[PDB]
Amino acid sequence: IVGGYTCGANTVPYQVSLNSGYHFCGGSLINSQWVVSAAHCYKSGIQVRLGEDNINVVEGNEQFISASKSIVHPSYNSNTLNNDIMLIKLKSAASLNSRVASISLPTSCASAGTQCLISGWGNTKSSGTSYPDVLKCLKAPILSDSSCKSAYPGQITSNMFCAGYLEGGKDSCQGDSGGPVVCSGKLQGIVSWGSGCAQKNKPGVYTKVCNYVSWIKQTIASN
């Protein structure tokens, strides 16, 4: 997260860190046994880390659980990042409490201008890599479809939305991929891609979760 602030330990209780011997992507806990992340974060050997704040130090509240299976959307296109969503089933259920809790799926899509909270342990520099130890937060608004398409002509599908600041300076970045975009207490987006980080006129692009609620429910139900 570039231009964000320190969230504060466990203030984003649905945030998870996907670890394969190091932090590589974020995710969101949607129930005690399932996490939603981005399909481009797929790999084998994933350990899901819940109740984290400082990813380099065990401080208490952490729960490390191996992923039993990862289900990448069948229509995910790695070239366009269309349908960039994946569900991870945990080997055992997480113990939910105040520090570890799930986030609700939306019942409707959000409109442009809605303010949302984006969080993660991704790069904090738009020029160079500087990864933080603790969880960073950023409040960003969802942009209009016309500003989004103007910024990335021919690259935005109906399963994506832009959020951020066209003036640059504040945005999600590499390492934040797979993480949550929460608006009014509902998970509306998944950090997917962008051109660089926090560059002027190049806002972040997010997977539009409201278009996948039925798929998520159907898939969880059958697995």
Ligand X SMILES: NC(=[NH2+])c1ccc2[nH]c(-c3cc([C@@H](CC(=O)[O-])C(=O)[O-])cc(Br)c3[O-])nc2c1
**Could you give the residue numbers annotated as active site?**
40, 84, 177
Cβ proximity to ligand X, 80 vs 174, nearer residue = 174
CB of 38 to ligand X, least distance (A): 8
Task: Work out what residue 197 binds among Ca ion, ligand X, none; the CB cut-off runs from 5 to 8 Å by kind.
Answer: ligand X
CB of 173 to ligand X, least distance (A): 5
**For the stretch 201-213, what's the b/e string if a residue is b when 16 or more beta carbons lie within 10 angstroms of its beta carbon?**
ebbbbbbbbbbbe
Query: Reading across the β-sheet that carries 115-120, which strands appear in turn?
Result: 5-6, 136-141, 115-120, 180-183, 186-193, 204-208, 160-163
Is 167 annotated to bind a ligand? Reply is no
Residue 189 sits in the site that holds ligand X (CB under 6 A):
no
Residue 54 sits in the site that holds Ca ion (CB under 5 A):
yes
Q: Which residue has the tokens 């670890």?
A: 19
Residue 150 sits in the site that holds Ca ion (CB under 5 A):
no
Binding mask of the shown chain, residues 136 to 175, with x at each position contacting ligand X by CB under 6 A = -----------------------------------xxxx-
CA pseudo-torsion sign 170, 202, 212, 144? positive
CB of 177 to ligand X, least distance (A): 4
Beta-carbon contacts of 166 under 8 Å, excluding residues fewer than 6 positions away, are: 143, 147, 151, 200, 201, 203
Is 133 annotated to bind a ligand? Reply is no
